[PDB]
Amino acid sequence: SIDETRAHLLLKEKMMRLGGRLVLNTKEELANERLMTLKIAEMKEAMRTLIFPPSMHFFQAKHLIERSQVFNILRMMPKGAALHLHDIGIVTMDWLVRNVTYRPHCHICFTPRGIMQFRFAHPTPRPSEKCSKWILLEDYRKRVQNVTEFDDSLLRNFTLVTQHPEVIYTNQNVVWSKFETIFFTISGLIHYAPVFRDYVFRSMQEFYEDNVLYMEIRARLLPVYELSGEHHDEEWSVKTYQEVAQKFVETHPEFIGIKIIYSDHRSKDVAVIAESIRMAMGLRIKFPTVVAGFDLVGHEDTGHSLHDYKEALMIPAKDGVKLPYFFHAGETDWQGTSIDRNILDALMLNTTRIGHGFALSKHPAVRTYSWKKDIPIEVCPISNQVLKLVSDLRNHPVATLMATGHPMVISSDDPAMFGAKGLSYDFYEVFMGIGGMKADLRTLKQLAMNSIKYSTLLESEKNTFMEIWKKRWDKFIADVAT
Amino acid sequence: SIDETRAHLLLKEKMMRLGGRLVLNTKEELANERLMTLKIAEMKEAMRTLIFPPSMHFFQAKHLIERSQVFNILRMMPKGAALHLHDIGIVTMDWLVRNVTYRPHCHICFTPRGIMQFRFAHPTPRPSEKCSKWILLEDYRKRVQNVTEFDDSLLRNFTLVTQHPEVIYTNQNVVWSKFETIFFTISGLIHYAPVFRDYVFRSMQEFYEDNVLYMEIRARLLPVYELSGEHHDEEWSVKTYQEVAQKFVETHPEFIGIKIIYSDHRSKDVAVIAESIRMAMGLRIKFPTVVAGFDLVGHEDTGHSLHDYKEALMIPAKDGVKLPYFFHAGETDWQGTSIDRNILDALMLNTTRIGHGFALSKHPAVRTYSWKKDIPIEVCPISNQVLKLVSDLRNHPVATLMATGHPMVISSDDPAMFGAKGLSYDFYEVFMGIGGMKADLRTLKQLAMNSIKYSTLLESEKNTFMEIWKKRWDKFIADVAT
Ligand SMILES: *[C@@H]1O[C@H](CO)[C@@H](O)[C@H](O)[C@H]1NC(C)=O
Ligand SMILES: *[C@@H]1O[C@H](CO)[C@@H](O)[C@H](O)[C@H]1NC(C)=O
Ligand SMILES: *[C@@H]1O[C@H](CO)[C@@H](O)[C@H](O)[C@H]1NC(C)=O
Ligand SMILES: *[C@@H]1O[C@H](CO)[C@@H](O)[C@H](O)[C@H]1NC(C)=O
Ligand SMILES: *[C@@H]1O[C@H](CO)[C@@H](O)[C@H](O)[C@H]1NC(C)=O
Ligand SMILES: *[C@H]1O[C@H](CO)[C@@H](O)[C@H](O)[C@H]1NC(C)=O
Ligand SMILES: [Zn+2]
Ligand SMILES: [Zn+2]
């Protein structure tokens, strides 16, 4: 009878963890048995040596994750949708260097502070205040002793990846300062119109290859420029995303496409943000099928709170309009402060999803409210480790939320800046590190289905997506089972 | 109405966090205002610079914590009782060096592998297999060219404290190896009878000075020895603890005293532990007023599970007797394994308190069960940081438990090994790091009161303890408010 009490507590936990109540068919039971055999063996070996990739910094863990048989299976898994991604962090940086900086008219410069920047131009742009002289990359490479090393030095400027990140990034402000500097550096490359088109297309190629069929992207929609010196506007960029995504779907018929969440930086004044909000409303009118809504991005600890922006964020409501929100909220180690209260405020503003919600488990009333309104968190484990929110992912606060089956989706945020690609590395971190040893095929299946459920697609489009994914899921299962 | 919802959610979180329903009188309201003002000021500054002691390693944080005005108030607070302590980690190591190692008849020696060892003896003992030459400290001392340097060498060998603990202790097995080696090395100093008596007395002096009035100690009851080489038994050490505590209470009449939880090491075979369990039952008959029960200690990740010991641990029930248990359980980063299942098994064995329960928040059925049977966890935050379970204490899993007011007590475990003293450093980590910015005077008062409630004292003794504590509390409140 105590023996029965113990059995009951274990079964209750089995049923309440994420995916616990899902029914597997006989072929799925076999796939589960095989995947769990490999997962348990990897875990046993990690317990012996303490070489456990989720407990190490991703920069040093990556090469080990790539050798994991569990990682190999996760790679093959149709993961559904990537719902939390930013515009310029979703394409492997190698291609920016090896392909893009080798294109005609590419110039490089270094600021007074010494920050690398790029510009496509003809003729050579004239010295400005941010650039003493621009140098044609073709000319520069004629003058360097070892081109291979020069190119690699460019690649090092384009990602946070480093040996000894504990020495290099001593605190969260330093890592954010480096992060932001990267966006500044690569921006002149990506926002040149022919590169912009090629970039958007390649990001779809990379996710498709990783068995991801739908992307929603937080996009700043900064001006895209031509050689002629002309700059385009926000509407042009949204049209271009739609056009490139339509082109990709033509040759990739199971790919669903992309939607855009227009975003602006949370360092900005409330009047400026009010203008972004009006722009968001207008963009929703012009492209109801492409623009999902609005979000505020940037370093959450040091920028403005959602409360600070109350008057701007209430505009759509004061005008009788629904503007969907996807707020980044609670991406912080602090508790009981104005920063983690952003989660409550995002919910009061009827957010559709919460970006990160890392602080959520410390707020049990907010957690309940979120659970009751079925508003998921978007969890990006690698991002949280790299930007120093938690050191060992076995301590990630989402573990507690996985154990009670809270609504969530997994995504990768800015994988290219961390040396990741698509969604698979992030799925490995959740499946192996955050969900513990008893996370199983039902966990994975639930996370994949959730990413379809919590997308902003029409219900009729979700049904179609679900049908496409179920067939991909069946082929995956067959492969793993045999 | 949306404004009202927001207010309700915050009020609910206010009422359900630990201590949230406690009613403060007007003098306590004033004390809380002053304490929270200083706490908010310290946190605001930490947020500006990111120099935040709970987020840093305690070895590097301590000098800043000692400068904190909040720490100064906590040192003054009557904290009630220390309920999770080990026998040889509770006296500042400085005294073991400056005082004990200068006592007549103290020898030092080195094992074949080079591990330092001590023995008090007269005359000098013969060379043995574990020691090839015992050398008197007085002899050894003049031979060195700087005796102040040799002394400091000893002090550095008696604690884990170091610069660059990330470099020195690269994993949990390494820190545990050094940890246990310290216990081996100091053991010969402390188990000589006159020192053993003096050690126990000084441990009470240190906690008393820190405004702690009662202690329960996990004690291995290792043989205590005389100059002649004679060894005493378990019964003798229990009688000695009772006698020394009685002596202390005689001149410190507000001090409640001590009790002993007999413990044995979890690396041992099940039959050997069955012998310890019979010993525990016998000690309980002989000393029902002094011996509270039994616990299993040692590195939990690498030793036997409670399940493995089921046969031994059921002996009292099979013999018709209640042996109270106080199990260390779930002191681990792993999840879904046999290690974190120790919490469930502790509870199935009717444990009175859980040591650590670090993994508890990841087990919601187990968490509910322990809440329903009112079984508390004993939280030792500095221990968990130093032994590498979590790097930033803002991420400590007990934060989630504090937010729902889960039953718990704070203790210090082995403060001497970490460079701590008494209970105040652990109370600072809980109040500033784990409980967040909103933890307040009610948080502190509840935890102090909890440590009386969850002690093993008779209800009539808890009543008397509460009366003594309340007088010290009122004086503390008057000081802080003025
Ligand atoms: C970035 O590139 C510059 C130019 O070659 C080089 O000086 C520097 O080492 C690179 N930065 C990093 C962090 O590798
Ligand atoms: C660069 O990439 C584009 C497609 O984005 C394509 O024109 C070409 O294959 C690449 N160039 C080279 C030299 O590989
Ligand atoms: C959220 O929904 C409520 C109920 O319809 C409404 O009163 C409020 O205006 C909405 N808020 C926003 C910011 O859209
Ligand atoms: C104490 O000295 C030993 C043996 O020389 C050394 O290896 C060990 O790391 C030291 N332990 C400490 C400083 O805790
Ligand atoms: C715990 O209590 C139950 C029910 O009274 C009893 O059956 C069991 O033997 C007890 N276990 C121990 C270890 O005392
Ligand atoms: C240290 O040892 C005891 C305390 O246990 C004390 O009575 C004695 O005075 C001290 N010895 C010295 C040399 O200060
Ligand atoms: Zn993001
Ligand atoms: Zn302990």
Curated annotation (Swiss-Prot), chains A, B:
Region (PRB domain): 99-157
Recorded effect of pH on activity: Optimum pH is 6.6.
Cofactor entry: Zn(2+)
Residues the record lists as binding substrate: 87, 176-183, 265, 298, 414
GO molecular function annotation: adenosine deaminase activity; adenosine receptor binding; growth factor activity; heparin binding; protein homodimerization activity; proteoglycan binding; zinc ion binding
EC number: 3.5.4.4
Keyword Zinc: yes
Glycosylation site list: 99, 146, 157, 350
Cellular localization per UniProt: Secreted
Binding site for Zn(2+): 84, 86, 328, 413
Documented effect of changing residue 109 to G: Abolishes secretion
Tissue specificity remark: Detected in blood plasma (at protein level). Widely expressed, with most abundant expression in human adult heart, lung, lymphoblasts, and placenta as well as fetal lung, liver, and kidney. In embryo, expressed in the outflow tract and atrium of the developing heart, the VII/VIII cranial nerve ganglion, and the notochord.
Region (Dimerization): 2-72
Note: Candidate gene for the Cat Eye Syndrome (CES), a developmental disorder associated with the duplication of a 2 Mb region of 22q11.2. Duplication usually takes in the form of a surpernumerary bisatellited isodicentric chromosome, resulting in four copies of the region (represents an inv dup(22)(q11)). CES is characterized clinically by the combination of coloboma of the iris and anal atresia with fistula, downslanting palpebral fissures, preauricular tags and/or pits, frequent occurrence of heart and renal malformations, and normal or near-normal mental development.
Function description: Adenosine deaminase that may contribute to the degradation of extracellular adenosine, a signaling molecule that controls a variety of cellular responses. Requires elevated adenosine levels for optimal enzyme activity. Binds to cell surfaces via proteoglycans and may play a role in the regulation of cell proliferation and differentiation, independently of its enzyme activity.
Oligomer status and interactors: Homodimer. Interacts with adenosine receptors. Binds heparin.
Domain comment quoted from the record: The PRB domain is involved in receptor binding, and may be responsible for the cytokine-like growth factor activity due to it's sharing of several structural properties with chemokines. High-affinity binding to heparin/glycosaminoclycan (GAG) is mediated by a large, highly positively charged surface at the interface of dimer's subunits involving approximately residues 30-45, 389-396, and 422-428.
Name of the protein: Adenosine deaminase 2
Protein source organism: Homo sapiens (Human)
